[PDB]
Every structure is written in C-alpha cells, then in structure tokens.
C-alpha cells in the first residue's frame, strides 16, 4: 500500500436546523431539508448546495453529509 486510497468523500447533505443568510449569495433553508450538495468547498466549512429553487452556501454547523445518497422524506411547502 503506497497512496491512501479510500472512499472519504460524499455527495449529499441534510440541514439540521434553519440557516439564514444576508448577502444574496447564500442559500438559506428550514431544520429537516435535503441539501444537494452540488459543490464541495472547505469540506468542513462552507458548503455549495442547492435545493427548491435555492443554490448558494451553508455552514457545516447545521448540516449533515448522506454518502448514501439517498432520498430521504421531506416536507414540500412554498411559502407565500
């Protein structure tokens, strides 16, 4: 074994909690929301997601990384 080669990677997310954000280059969401983690960042950091109709960043504080990819159940509701 020369070269660490191991699957440390990941491909989706899930807010734990409500993120806000002011600078109209972030992307804000509610507690319980399926981030697609379109770009990795700092991997620790920031992070580039995006979901209904919302694309931008996020800190790993309130965010969780599902290397399954799996679609898990969430709530659909556009506030008006």
Same mark, same amino acid.
């Given at each position: ?49 995006? /979901? ?6 996020? $800190? &790993?504080?309130? @965010?969780?990384?599902? /290397? ?6 969430? $709530? &659909?509701?556009? @506030?008006?």
């Amino acid at each position: 074994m020369g070269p660490l080669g191991s699957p440390e990677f990941a491909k989706y997310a899930r807010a734990l909690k409500d993120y806000n954000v002011s600078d109209t280059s972030l992307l804000p969401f509610k507690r319980n929301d399926i981030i697609t983690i379109t770009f990795k960042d700092q991997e620790n950091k920031w992070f580039m997601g995006q /979901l209904n109709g919302k694309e931008g960043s996020f $800190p &790993v504080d309130h @965010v969780e990384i599902l /290397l399954s990819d799996v679609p898990p159940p969430q $709530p &659909v509701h556009p @506030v008006a």
